[PDB]
Design a protein around this ligand. Sequence first.
Ligand code: VO4
Length: 190
Amino acid sequence: KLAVAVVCSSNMNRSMEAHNFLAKKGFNVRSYGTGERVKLPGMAFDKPNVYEFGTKYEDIYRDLESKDKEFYTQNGLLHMLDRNRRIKKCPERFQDTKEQFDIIVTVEERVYDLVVMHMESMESVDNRPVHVLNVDVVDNAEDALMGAFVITDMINMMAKSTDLDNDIDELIQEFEERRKRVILHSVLFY
Ligand code: VO4
């Protein structure tokens, strides 16, 4: 089976909706954040809320519900965190994992550049190819769902291949034609 990672900035919304959805379809999936820290917004000429990666979703929830339970349920982050709590203990940060994947999917260009920069600045002697794909998804609950569909549909297609390194270029193109999207693609090595 393919090992897949899905990566946004904070590992709270887009990467976690896609996480949920890929796992519910049977995929081997982990998810990560490329930011320095996790941030979540609140009254928005305010400084948002910040927590180190490795902080539990449960405690973040608890920290916001005791800050203004109504506010954070209206803007749907209590919901979001409740949902995340059930998948895994805490947001994880991509530049500190040592997990290895066949495909890492980023949801925006800044994340895509942080991932590719990060792996280039490594290097070992596995020489094993990992494919980094960007599939743009907008950062709100609604588009996180829609983006999870599009991501799952693409993985589902790549998971048919028994020779992914030689098929992938061509699958990317069919998919781009059929969903009318641009998929950035890098090949990196572990
Ligand atoms: O946790 V992510 O907000 O960058 O969708």
